Design a protein around this ligand. Structure first.
Ligand SMILES: NC(=O)c1ccc[n+]([C@@H]2O[C@H](COP(=O)([O-])OP(=O)(O)OC[C@H]3O[C@@H](n4cnc5c(N)ncnc54)[C@H](O)[C@@H]3O)[C@@H](O)[C@H]2O)c1
Ligand SMILES: NC(=O)c1ccc[n+]([C@@H]2O[C@H](COP(=O)([O-])OP(=O)(O)OC[C@H]3O[C@@H](n4cnc5c(N)ncnc54)[C@H](O)[C@@H]3O)[C@@H](O)[C@H]2O)c1
Ligand SMILES: Cn1nc2cc(N3CCOc4cc(C(=O)N5CCC(F)(F)CC5)ccc43)ccn2c1=O
Ligand SMILES: Cn1nc2cc(N3CCOc4cc(C(=O)N5CCC(F)(F)CC5)ccc43)ccn2c1=O
Lengths: 255, 255
């Protein structure tokens, strides 16, 4: 189901997004790597081009929270690769200080990107259907005392995705929407909990998170990519909230 | 436990917010009615003045989604009444068409209002503690096919409020933060499901909501206000997610 498909992955320069790009590439997708960090993107594209044919990937610099630029980016992806099959709204930040920007990136941009994915992929517009995967977190399901707004953002993604999936069935768009909710993942974002710039008033309680990181353990990005691929290959999965934890592996929130 | 306390209720001009204001007035609070609807707000305070003493209420016109107005409105309330004890972040809209505004109103404003509430009320800032109640919805706990962004916003409030409650404990702020998640309530917002202006692309699916309304029935605003009073009066309730249904009345989400 993945071979020959065109995926747009936001936040693809590193971490989970990069892992998605690699997993999709390994299974024969073409991937637009979309990220606001041009330097990390360049390095990512360089590394991918050592493992994959260059025609298989495209780097586009975009701040997903800039809606005009996001729209431009979708236009570029479809102009470059001719179609869109898979959208992964993966970009996210931890910033409890500039918390409005956290909401803009983590939630608003997931909704706007989702809506663009439906415009490009819905059968209602003559598309072939497709899949949209949105990156939530266990923080989308349970509280995080040291990051309430991050928590808010990931909760929003759960409710939004479950609802949009239901609406997709009703509209016969042919688009399946699912969300992934990882435990801690071994990526650079974990570093953010050390910085008053990112934690603001919550910086003083950062060691509680550091303890949870060690006691729950951390997930390898490839494992999340495995979850991604599962979602993409199983066309029964719509509205699914996929949980990935070190203890229970890849499973689902039941409602 | 309520007598002589100062309450700020957003969305106070009508609906659940008006019910909160009345319930609080009945229990001896002073209430700042904050709402963007000048006409409704003026008539609300006029109606309240016929039943309660005029000095117990202050109407302030404010778009809560305008953070500068919100901040200013907080300053005017505390200047007028001399302190803040109870913040009810109750304003919300249903608008899946200009869904960015819906997030600004339903989620951004709840967080910014909460943060303002804590600025005044936290012990660590020279406050004497108090309570913040956020208005979620059952849409904060489950999907709504015909209003995905409303759902996202209400989910956001649940994640935010449970998280901030835990933080308030860590920080010994002396503030309790709870959320209420009603089923359908007999207010003017129910009319919006009939309008393309509010429903946008989901307008064609509104009958499903209408069917749920007939299925579940409709709650009276005063019952919701009874839920508010329960939260204010019980100092053991922090991070509680109160559900109010026709079937079960006032109860709590168990996690
Ligand atoms: N790592 C974890 O523990 C964890 C757990 C649960 C969920 N998540 C979520 O997984 C997703 C991926 O994060 P990660 O762990 O790989 O972190 P990361 O910080 O290493 O990678 C995030 C990537 O997104 C990009 N990005 C951020 N804001 C952007 C914007 N406005 N426009 C474009 N690109 C932007 C960054 O430049 C970066 O390349 C995020 O949504 C994060 O919230 C992470
Ligand atoms: N009525 C329901 O079935 C139901 C169910 C669950 C939750 N809720 C929530 O209850 C709350 C109260 O809504 P309601 O049912 O009383 O509806 P309503 O439309 O009758 O009242 C909402 C009030 O909020 C005000 N408001 C809206 N946006 C504002 C803004 N930007 N700035 C200032 N004031 C603003 C409106 O002017 C109005 O007076 C909302 O948060 C709503 O989402 C309602
Ligand atoms: C059984 N079990 N339960 C849990 C609960 C987990 N939590 C609760 C605390 O905060 C979290 C944050 C994020 C999160 O998205 N992060 C980490 C902090 C950040 F880097 F800033 C942003 C990205 C994910 C999960 C959790 C984790 C593993 N867990 C597990 O294995
Ligand atoms: C057991 N049980 N389960 C449920 C589920 C309910 N739902 C799911 C569908 O949508 C909702 C919307 C709102 C909501 O906040 N609204 C209504 C629509 C609006 F006017 F536009 C905005 C404000 C509230 C609840 C529900 C309702 C009662 N329920 C019950 O009693």
């Amino acid at each position: 189901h993945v071979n020959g498909k065109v995926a747009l992955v936001t936040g693809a320069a590193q971490g989970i997004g990069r892992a998605f790009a690699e997993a999709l590439l390994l299974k024969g997708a073409k991937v637009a790597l979309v990220d606001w960090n041009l330097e990390a993107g360049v390095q990512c594209k360089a590394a991918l081009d050592e493992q994959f044919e260059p025609q298989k990937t495209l780097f586009i610099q975009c701040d997903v929270a800039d809606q005009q630029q996001l729209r431009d980016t979708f236009r570029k992806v479809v102009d470059h690769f001719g179609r869109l099959d898979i959208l992964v709204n993966n970009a996210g930040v931890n910033n409890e200080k500039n918390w409005e920007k956290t909401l803009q990136i983590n939630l608003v941009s997931v909704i706007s990107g989702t809506y663009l994915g439906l415009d490009y992929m819905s059968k209602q517009n003559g598309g072939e259907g497709g899949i949209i995967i949105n990156m939530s977190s266990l923080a989308g399901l349970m509280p995080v005392a040291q990051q309430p707004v991050y928590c808010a953002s990931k909760h929003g993604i759960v409710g939004f995705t479950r609802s949009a999936a239901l609406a997709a069935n009703l509209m016969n768009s042919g688009v399946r929407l699912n969300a992934i909710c990882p435990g801690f993942v071994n990526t650079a974002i974990l570093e953010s909990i050390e910085k008053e710039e990112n934690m603001g008033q919550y910086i003083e309680y950062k060691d509680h998170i550091k303890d949870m990181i060690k006691y729950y353990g951390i997930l390898d990005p490839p494992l999340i990519a495995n979850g991604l691929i599962t979602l993409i290959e199983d066309d029964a999965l719509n509205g699914a909230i996929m949980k990935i934890t070190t203890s229970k592996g890849i499973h689902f929130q039941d409602y």
